[PDB]
Amino acid sequence: GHMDEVQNRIKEILDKHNNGIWISKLPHFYKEFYKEDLNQGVLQQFEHWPHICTVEKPCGGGQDSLLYPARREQPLKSDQDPEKELPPPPPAPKQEVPSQGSPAVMPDVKEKVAELLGKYSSGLWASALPKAFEDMYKVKFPEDALKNLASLSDVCTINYISGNTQKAILYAKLPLPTDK
């Protein structure tokens, strides 16, 4: 052992004193206590040591610094901080969705069709789409909404049976391209 003893004696004086020592008075303090001429390089040790002391520039020092003892060790260098308390994901529970944005153009007729398609693994067949519309939402509404196969093709995959455009089926297409 050697450098560990130099380390431990500077924390010993500074801890015993509690009130730190000015860097200019440190060398004669060291000479008095440990009977040795402090080399100038040990000042550089004092500047870098995280476990022995802290160099401080109190406002009254002006042109020199105080060596406080190691009580200020390990301030925010835990290297385990992400798991010391591991807080929940959001900024706070009141902010569970930091993101913001708006939905797509989906008027009530599109919404009726889109949910209605969602209710059936069978899809809705060309006649069953009107029947299920009127039954489920308890409405009797314009043929402009329930016979306009094109608007239904905006909300649904429309595909045919018995021939091209001979009989029709609807499956969900549920357009929601909006990301913001």
Side-chain angles (χ1 to χ4, degrees):
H2 176 70
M3 228 303 289
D4 67 293
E5 203 202 270
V6 192
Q7 275 184 96
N8 281 272
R9 102 280 242 82
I10 306 302
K11 55 179 288 185
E12 182 185 79
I13 18 170
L14 296 176
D15 181 72
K16 184 272 189 292
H17 295 323
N18 180 272
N19 85 103
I21 285 169
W22 291 106
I23 330 302
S24 313
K25 86 189 297 182
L26 205 307
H28 79 245
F29 232 120
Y30 187 86
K31 179 55 166 64
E32 280 289 275
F33 269 57
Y34 304 105
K35 306 307 193 290
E36 177 63 280
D37 173 55
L38 190 76
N39 186 272
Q40 294 184 319
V42 208
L43 307 186
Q44 200 179 266
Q45 257 69 248
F46 308 162
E47 289 181 272
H48 81 63
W49 277 340
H51 301 319
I52 314 300
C53 47
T54 304
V55 172
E56 193 54 271
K57 288 181 177 180
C59 304
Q63 62 182 312
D64 195 13
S65 312
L66 209 82
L67 269 158
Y68 280 83
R71 303 316 193 89
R72 297 155 180 264
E73 69 178 280
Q74 215 301 70
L76 218 177
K77 301 298 298 184
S78 313
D79 193 50
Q80 194 169 271
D81 177 272
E83 69 174 82
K84 81 182 187 199
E85 209 65 80
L86 28 70
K94 277 66 177 290
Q95 299 181 265
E96 68 179 283
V97 282
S99 313
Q100 186 60 279
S102 303
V105 178
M106 286 288 283
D108 83 283
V109 177
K110 281 83 264 195
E111 186 173 80
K112 284 164 174 161
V113 180
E115 272 205 73
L116 170 51
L117 264 298
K119 313 313 173 180
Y120 284 85
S121 311
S122 316
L124 278 309
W125 287 42
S127 306
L129 187 291
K131 287 178 68 175
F133 245 179
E134 287 185 332
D135 177 74
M136 184 156 64
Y137 296 99
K138 188 46 172 181
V139 275
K140 302 295 289 186
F141 60 106
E143 288 190 280
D144 179 71
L146 52 77
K147 302 316 182 62
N148 188 348
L149 194 69
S151 307
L152 307 182
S153 306
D154 180 74
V155 249
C156 311
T157 285
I158 298 200
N159 163 65
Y160 308 112
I161 335 174
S162 307
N164 180 54
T165 329
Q166 184 63 46
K167 133 68 94 296
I169 236 189
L170 300 89
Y171 299 118
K173 184 65 273 293
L174 216 172
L176 186 67
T178 40
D179 181 68
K180 183 176 183 290

